[PDB]
Subunit: 434 residues, 2 copies
């Protein structure tokens, strides 16, 4: 037998269902989303960190003018100064006091402590959720991990589970993200080659140890104003440091739908943003014949102090009478109230209490003790507590959320208005035929 | 100096331009696309090959029965055979001739030659184009590589050029591709875990050496008929070899805009499909003063035997009245005709010749001989050769594709009909005032 149903993406919060077969007994169906993960397909655009702005020794030639050729090093800024008189310790460094040439060289490199402190720029594509499911059908508890794609038959034991395509995906990661020390940022980093100075991506490379290092940080070499040797240079502030100053908050503190963000690999776990269409191929071994199932005669609901809340507020007792011994499932067919229990060992002519939760002010739903569908009615008071530490077990649907007294009052006013309108029109009609 | 232009994406057939400042004279601009490549972002979604379907030794236990536990091996299928009596060399194997048990196991595994004969199933996303550009200005020729995103400063030794966003990338690779032995295919392979027997992807892994191999080939174990110790099994045929049977043609042979597909990395080179906006910053070291540039006083043009074709057919001769020896550029200011040469040596009051190609029967265009403009008129013939081995240097527009003689006849008829209608209406006007 194949049962196709729809489960909310909330972690925990067990989902009830009834499996009714024409040739077998109804079966309790439990579906719990124990965990989920939204893993995007990512690629490494580049990696960046603080630079080193290492400066080589100046090249001095005296009565001779020399030029410097191009180099493949990042930020290869090279300047030529004439008329310099270099002077280290001991004495003047050379001769030709009026005619010299000092060559000053500058090029950036990754800082030595960039193996730890480095930001990797990733491009994020579409993400496919992988859901961890637990099914407690017919005293058989199967734990499985399956992909939400609609084509993958991934399940354990003889059970088979296909999770259909998700109702809607929101992609918490933007198309460009930045990962640093386990922190994820939705930052629009510049592309490879596109390199603003003094901001993020000022120095780039394909890998940390890659020799193809590129940068466009503004290095300006200046003429030495003191009669010594050195390379005076003005440089833009490190854009990695400026980004770390103004990084904002990581995605772990701003992800919608309560997504908990991890890296290696990048993923969003324990999200809740929609409904999974799931098809389950239940084995025939767990199914029990209707002849062996106790066919129950008559039941009735009597509710005791129901409170509509996120908690299991409300305990109703069922008055039943059954032909023989044996257990049978319980289920609430309405999508408004949920029942805590799933199987009771009913015996004969007694009463069993069950705790239930609901959201609507009025509790009209269907209890299916041994499959005996019975409509149950109750009046529930608003909860006294304001904030609760556990999530709601059912979503409002805005048709039963209107209370019975309010429903009756609205239909009373519209019925009275329509009645006076119709009697006005029929007075017009009978005056017209006169 | 920022010059904005829009060059064709076609490799070869170089693009001519004239850059003219207010006061630093005209200068040539020779923009050549020597190479291009589309390198899309891909991720390994699985790898597949033939399976070995290694069958382990049977486990025969007697005077009893045993069951086998499920394993994590790829496509594990195990069965229990009752009432066997094996005969390998030496006679019967054990006691309870009527009560025996044979345990048969079967699982698949990559073939020993899967290191080469393997198909990598990849998901492909949007691609970024990268151009090799040969830019000639003055006497300087520079070769330089630029990404096509409008943001990346592709630079020569001294040049700053930006390749703007492409008109419309066509993406020859679909969302799913398969790479085998250097041949790529646009194949809609099943996802991870979505195995089916007798089709591509029936065995899957993240790598050739990955232990987590999963497969769902239709394998079944059968009861042995002859009383020996073999394991009779029957399995569905390998969908890898079935896919190689009818893979169709690779993308190297079936690709729009006819461009060469390579692997490692997966790229599409020399794809002529559009127009690249180019904003180039010409250095001022080549912008000569207008006074030093030898200007001309009187310019006249003629043309002999214009043949419109992809080849540079047509010789156009200019009579000039220059005042100084030197050289200065030439350019055609029509999108319909393009000149062969860029700069011409000019002495004084002489005659020069140029070659050009056009796609219109009429050649009504503008030659800018060394600063100023001069119009030229012609009537070009269709070429004798039906097929030429080189692409066209210009496109076709509806205004130029109609010949001057045909333009005359068509407007002669249209204007005759229109003026005939207007003269009918004015005869109506003079009759109505009567
Ligand atoms: C299912 O579980 C209940 C509670 O443990 C047990 O008493 C009952 O016999 C079980 N039903 C079957 C059919 O095994
Ligand atoms: C950024 O740096 C400035 C100093 O320039 C400092 O005052 C400030 O706290 C830093 N952080 C933010 C978020 O502005
Ligand atoms: C370019 O070269 C020509 C001849 O090749 C020479 O006469 C001239 O000096 C050069 N002009 C410029 C502007 O570089
Ligand atoms: C497929 O393999 C069969 C052999 O069974 C062969 O006859 C046939 O030509 C192959 N190709 C196609 C397209 O069927």
């Amino acid at each position: 037998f194949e049962h196709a149903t729809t489960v909310p993406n909330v972690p925990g919060i067990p989902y009830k269902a009834l499996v009714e077969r024409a040739g077998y007994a109804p079966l309790n169906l439990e579906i719990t989303v124990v965990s989920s993960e939204l893993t995007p397909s990512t690629n490494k655009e580049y990696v960046t960190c603080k630079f080193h702005t290492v400066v080589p020794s100046p090249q001095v030639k005296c009565c001779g003018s020399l030029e410097c050729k191009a180099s493949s090093k990042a930020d290869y800024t090279c300047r030529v100064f004439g008329g310099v008189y270099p002077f280290m310790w001991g004495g003047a460094q050379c001769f030709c006091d009026s005619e010299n040439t000092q060559l000053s060289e500058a090029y950036v490199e990754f800082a030595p402590d960039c193996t730890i402190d480095h930001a990797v720029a990733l491009k994020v594509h579409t993400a496919a959720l992988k859901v961890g499911l637990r099914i407690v059908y017919g005293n058989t508890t199967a734990r499985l991990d399956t992909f939400v794609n609609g084509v993958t038959p991934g399940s354990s034991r003889d059970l088979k589970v296909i999770a259909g395509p998700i109702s809607a995906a929101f992609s918490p990661f933007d198309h460009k993200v930045v990962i640093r020390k386990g922190l994820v940022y939705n930052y629009d980093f510049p592309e490879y080659g596109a390199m603003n100075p003094g901001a993020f991506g000022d120095i780039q490379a394909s890998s940390l140890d890659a020799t193809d290092i590129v940068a466009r940080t503004d290095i300006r070499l200046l003429k030495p104003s003191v009669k010594n040797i050195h390379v005076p240079y003005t440089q833009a502030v490190s854009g990695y440091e400026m980004w770390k100053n103004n990084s904002g908050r990581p995605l772990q503190e701003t992800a919608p739908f309560g997504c908990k963000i991890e890296v290696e690999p990048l993923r969003a776990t324990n999200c809740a943003y929609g409904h999974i269409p799931i098809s389950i191929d239940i084995p025939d071994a767990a199914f029990v014949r209707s002849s062996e199932s106790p066919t129950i005669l008559e039941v009735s609901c009597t509710v005791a102090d129901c409170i509509y809340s996120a908690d299991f507020g409300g305990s109703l007792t069922l008055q039943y009478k059954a032909n023989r011994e044996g257990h049978c499932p319980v289920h609430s067919h309405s999508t408004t109230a949920v029942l805590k229990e799933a199987t009771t060992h009913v015996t004969a002519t007694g009463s069993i209490t069950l705790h239930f939760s609901t959201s609507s002010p009025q509790a009209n739903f269907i209890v299916s003790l041994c499959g005996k569908k019975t409509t149950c009615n109750a009046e529930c008071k608003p909860p006294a507590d304001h904030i609760i530490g556990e999530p709601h077990k059912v979503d409002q649907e805005f048709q039963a959320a209107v209370s019975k007294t309010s429903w009756n009052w609205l239909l009373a006013l519209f019925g009275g208005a329509s009645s006076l309108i119709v009697v006005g029109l029929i007075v017009l009609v009978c005056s017209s035929m006169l």
